[PDB]
Design a protein around this nucleic acid. Structure first.
Lengths: 312, 204, 183, 317, 317, 317
DNA sequence: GGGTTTTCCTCGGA
RNA sequence: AUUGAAAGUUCUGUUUCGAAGAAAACCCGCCU
């Protein structure tokens, strides 16, 4: 599995919106519990949901799959990720509904043979024979770092008129988030049953699907996910990034504290010792000059990280 | 004939048990009423040679009582429950001092667990008349008006204070509703009756 | 994709700045990007009028309401759409008359909403001496963003695509005057 | 004598059971009628009989007398208050049955010198020459207070299981929570005094010597009742009792205070105590009041705090 | 005797269950009568029975007795406390039934010579010659404190499902939070002492020798109750428990401490203990207090910090 | 036994869900009774059930057992923990039903010889001869700390929509933030040991041989719970979790550590552990402390840095 | 212009 | 001092064992 944590610095941004009141457009906010020298406090800070991140990742995956030559569904070529959820989508795409439990496997294989998105990002179909497939990429809310006693975030409103008057909420924060991607189950059915004709093509295309899934992380690591990008282009830059490639489950430390790379490396080594693993590699990109450790590979950009992940 | 009226409270109730299965009497016999009065003068003696009960000389104190609330009859040993209720007693007969001093000290109507109480008394002189309206219970031969719907027949005793001796069987009509227990008035045309403080009394 | 960054030498906004001591929250004057968008579109109109590129009747005066309201459509004489299939026609029916709606995007809300996101993306101005960045998608000028069956009129757009992309390239000079990368 | 009226508060109790049906043990209840605007409502309220109170008081008196060195019957020391009722009890104890009526007094005093409980508790020997004796403490039923238009009492059933490893173990217990009140009288002046009329018989001087200690023990035995050491099923169902109000009158003439069924029962009993003292030419009348529920009191009373001070003042006077 | 009262704060607990309806498991509830400024009211609150407490105490006593070396019955080594109640238990253990009343004492001694549980926790045998032995430890229902006007307790239901791959599995569990209070009593002066009246029987010398060990084990067994390992459903609903206040009195005379309903129940208990020692002519009266909620206690009272210290002090004295 | 308590800080999480109303997905909430300077109050806070923790632990145990080589049941290889509860599961796995009580032991041994999950996590079979096996791991609800007067928790709702090109798609999700605390217990002295009383049955030699491997796997499986991979909705609501404080005690006698409600629960636990070892005549008692929030711990206590070191130390000893 | 779609709602011993 | 006097229906007992509300989804499209 490929896990990682990353920090971002975003200034003058409006990337996620909520229902508006009057002529004021609101930025999403959420509560957080933070520990200070005086105890524990509850505060309100702007946040960005992970749905936008998933949508951007899936769109980039569609683009890369179409460029390479992998099959893409009809409703997925247009950027509408309804997937094979309702009867209308199946009718448009042209796939019969499952008859019972025993046929479900076949259905899943067919769904995996037409759209890569339903294979990597998972899908759900509700009906007489519901079919589920959990996403192989996991994301979370983008939260400002809960470090020290003062949260490095701010939110205000701005005034605009048309030459007819409205207000727009604008926020600045130091966002941090982590991701996980298990590449050992891509193009592998998750429904229990018997062998079904057509899996040979899946086995042949597994390498291409894995390569495309690895390449698709460039969209998330570069920062093309948010909306309102036409007139509120955020200013983004990279500060710190840690990526771990393992053969056993492992979760890196969150980016709340300044010391989360060396702790992650030590925990990774000790967990490899404990769980009898066979592969554990770490990659670190550092630009803010924090402590890292010794005997760890250091990179300079993100494209090198993507290339190294692809090659290994 | 002098007389004295008294009002009484009851903590939980009275549980006089029928003589001769242990059924209970709906309303206490006058024997208990006169024993409660004899308690004032004969405290400390549980047996005096007549042997028999000490209250063998208070057999000429004719007096009655009645309820002034709502009560229930229970069998769980027949008992009557009328907590926090009222009971009016009229003593009509020794001089005024005897009645007004024994009456202010009335305790334990009935059994030892059947605690009683005295609220207030008053004294006066009675008058004898022979058509009057009454509430208190009376004997059997007393005549009642043309309607007869709220009367109960009970057996009581007279000369039975001496233990080891059987009490006399006498029928006595109580104007009572069986369920729930209450008292109902009855105009009486008899030969021997007494008026006391407005509330008329019928004897025979 | 034409992109780059530009440097030059009252409304205020917060910023999360980084110093040797760590992180701080400060307040600095800023300028909104809608003003730059208006200036860029005005210069685009001025450049387009120098050639045969069509210019909208309402957009002839410097009032970039585009075709948001029915009043603009009525004063410019373009029919409202009937169904979803008609959308592409409506789209070309408003791309064949104005270059601003094509480049900077437009919309029409109603029974059959029509959308076209901008091919030019801009942002706020923050002092470093101001610095900012832009983004220009050179591959989707005069290309119908709506999906559907082909409708008559695409040939004219194919003919004028070269002139339209030339105008989109040229119009950046207004913001440049007051580092570029192309693919 | 001494009289008292006490108001308690009990929760989660099973202190008086009745005949069990199936796997269910039932509580003891009494019917009461509550007056309403529409009419009357008959209800069943949990009660506690006075026999349990008498048993607890007698057991406490037995223990106190044994600790203080006073004669106690052989069968009474085993917490078996059969008392000298039948011939077998006398045969075990070693007392000769009364000869005739004139010697009956001779019997009574003798019984009073072998078992202290045969005096405070009182005995009733049956036979050809029956002998009578009245308990020197009178207790009433423990009943909820009918106050206002509602009864603060309840009765629910609880379901209990026995565990085993080879199933082949179910029972039900009735539990209650009410607001109990009860009253009592104690005539200490008649302690150690023979209650059969006749001529004096040798053996009364020792009773004269023992009168003080017997009265002190009888008064001491009230602490157990006023502290809540009565009832059954206390091993697994231990109730949580509490004291709310208490009025105790020390007099020299017969008297009984009003029941604690109204929200005001201290003032009225004070007024009627004064009237009774005036009528009966009384020289001894003292009032002791304990108040925890904040009800009106009046004037002319001594304010106490706990139950121990009440017993101390009862012993002193 | 060793008496005591104690408070507990329990959150997110399901420790006592009742019969379930549908897919809902119900928590035990009981009525309580509570006094407010507007009068008296009746409410419903979650409760915990004392049977579970007794079972936990007896199981801990079995464990401690087996560890020390005291005899434990065959059916008691396995945690099935049927004791010597039915004929099957006697047949399994191997003890003959009593023949008549005179033999009953012997039977009891034998029962006390094989199982410590039947000696400390009591036992009952029904038959031709019934034998009774009251438990030396007394407990009661665990009730939320009836303080003020608002009861600090709450009960709700929670939703649970079971995962499956072929849907063809839904239940609800009641969960409560409360401030529980309860009291206990343990007389250690009657441990390993027959309660049946009769004559001397061979084998009592071993009981006299082992009396000290039995008393020590009985005292040590209270750690389970004072620590809080009694309730069921502990595999997935591990309750969060903590101690708030505790008062223990060791006396030579009967005495009952004040319940923990009110904030002022320690100083009142101490004053009552002193006055009762004065009244009843006692010789020993000691009090131990564990306080964590910062309420008034008084002066001249020993203060502890934990429960193990209390157990050690109880053992030593 | 290995007991422990631990604190977690979780932000922007939706890990346990309940039935949804309309287009709003609800986060589980429960009532709590909390003590403030003004008395006692009842509040509502988000909670997480222990069923998810048990499911995650059992799934990790399945994975580790399959990797090592221990037998795993057919229905347990697929992550469906119905175990041997219904007749369909036995039919699929291929184990005959118990005939009577005497055969139960054999059945249990066979079930323990095929699936490790039915051995560590316990199992239940209902029928003519019911068979029970309590879980050797005990967990509870994950509760925000009830510290001080203000609960450090919050819950709100968030708005989400689905994009479409032909409108004809809106939902709300509840999100909570809290400082969770929870405790666990695991008795490793009964792993691979039948809990049903009876006679020796062939096949226990293999259980004795594999006991060490089963114990090692059970100890290793705690890494999943101590690392924080248990909750659902992890695809798009990946919680942010970190460790604050952790105490683990390894003993030979029963013991429960103090809950993590108060800042001082490590030093109290150590003192209580020492005193309990003294009281109960124990032979082994060790404590491990992981501290990151800088609270008082004490002296003479082993201090660690991560969780893997704790797992290694637990395995070695 | 959209403000939610299925799927299961306890099994047993006293 | 009353059909009154004398009388505990008391003793022993876990509703216990076990089970994820889980998978799918952009408030985004122009305004000095």
């Amino acid at each position: 599995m490929i896990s990682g944590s990353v920090r971002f610095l975003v200034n003058l941004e409006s990337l996620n919106g909520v229902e508006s009141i009057g002529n004021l457009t609101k930025h999403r906010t959420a509560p957080v519990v933070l520990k200070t020298s005086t105890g524990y406090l509850v505060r309100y800070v702007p946040v960005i949901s992970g749905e936008a991140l998933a949508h951007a990742y899936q769109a980039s995956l569609v683009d890369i799959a179409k460029k390479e030559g992998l099959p893409v569904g009809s409703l997925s070529s247009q950027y509408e990720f309804i997937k094979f959820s309702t009867d209308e989508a199946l009718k448009i795409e042209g796939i019969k509904e499952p008859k019972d439990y025993n046929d479900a496997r076949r259905f899943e294989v067919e769904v995996m043979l037409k759209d890569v998105i339903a294979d990597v990002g998972g899908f759900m179909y509700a009906g007489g024979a519901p079919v589920r497939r959990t996403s192989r990429i996991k994301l979370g809310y983008m939260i400002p770092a809960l470090r020290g006693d003062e949260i490095p975030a701010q939110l205000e409103a701005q005034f605009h008129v048309r030459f007819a008057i409205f207000n727009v909420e604008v926020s600045s924060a130091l966002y941090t988030f982590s991701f996980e991607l298990d590449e050992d189950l891509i193009a592998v059915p998750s429904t229990f049953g018997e062998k079904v004709k057509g899996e040979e093509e899946l086995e042949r295309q597994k390498a291409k699907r894995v390569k495309s899934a690895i390449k698709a992380l460039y969209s998330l690591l570069s920062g093309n996910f948010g909306g309102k990008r036409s007139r509120f282009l955020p200013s983004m830059k990279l500060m710190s990034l840690v990526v771990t490639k393992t053969d056993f489950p492992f979760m890196p430390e969150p980016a709340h504290d300044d010391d989360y790379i060396k702790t992650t490396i030590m925990r990774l080594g000790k967990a490899k010792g404990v769980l009898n693993g066979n592969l554990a590699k770490a990659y670190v990109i550092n630009n803010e000059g924090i402590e890292v450790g010794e005997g760890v590979t250091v990179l300079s950009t993100v494209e090198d990280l993507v290339v190294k992940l692809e090659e290994e | 004939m002098i007389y004295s009226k008294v009002f009484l409270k009851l903590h939980w109730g009275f549980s006089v048990v029928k003589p001769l299965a242990k059924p209970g009497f709906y309303l206490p016999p006058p024997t208990t009423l006169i024993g409660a009065l004899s308690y004032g003068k004969f405290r400390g003696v549980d047996n005096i040679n007549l042997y028999g009960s000490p209250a063998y000389n208070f057999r000429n104190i004719m007096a009655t009582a009645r309820l002034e609330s709502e009560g229930v009859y229970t069998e769980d040993t027949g008992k009557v429950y009328i907590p926090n209720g009222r009971l009016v007693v009229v003593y009509v007969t020794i001089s005024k001092e005897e009645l007004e001093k024994l009456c202010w000290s009335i305790t334990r109507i009935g059994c030892k667990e059947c605690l009683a109480s005295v609220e207030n008394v008053e004294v006066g002189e009675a008058k004898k008349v022979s058509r009057v309206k009454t509430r208190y219970y009376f004997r059997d031969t007393v005549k009642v008006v043309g309607r007869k719907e709220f009367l109960e027949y009970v057996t009581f005793w007279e000369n039975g204070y001496i233990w080891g001796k059987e009490g006399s069987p006498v029928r006595y009509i109580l104007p009572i509703t069986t369920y729930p227990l209450a008292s109902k008035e009855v105009e009486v045309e008899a030969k021997e009756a007494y008026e006391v403080g407005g509330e008329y009394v019928v004897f025979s | 994709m034409i992109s780059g960054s530009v440097r030059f030498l009252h409304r205020t906004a917060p910023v999360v700045l980084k110093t040797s001591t760590g992180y701080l929250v400060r307040y600095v004057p800023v300028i909104s990007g809608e003003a730059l968008a208006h200036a860029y579109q005005a210069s685009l109109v001025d450049i387009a009028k120098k050639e045969g590129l069509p210019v909208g009747s309402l957009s002839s005066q410097y009032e970039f309401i585009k075709f948001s309201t029915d009043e603009a459509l009525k004063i410019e004489g373009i029919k409202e759409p009937k169904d979803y299939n008609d959308a592409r026609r409506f789209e070309v029916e408003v791309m064949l008359k104005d270059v601003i709606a094509d480049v900077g995007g437009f919309m029409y809300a109603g029974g059959a909403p029509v959308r076209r996101t901008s091919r030019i993306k801009l942002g706020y101005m923050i002092p470093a001496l101001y610095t900012f960045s832009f983004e220009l998608d050179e591959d989707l000028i005069a290309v119908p963003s709506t999906f559907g069956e082909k409708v008559k009129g695409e040939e004219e757009l194919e003919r004028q695509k070269a002139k339209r992309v030339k105008s989109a390239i040229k119009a950046l000079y207004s913001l440049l005057s007051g580092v570029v990368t192309k693919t």
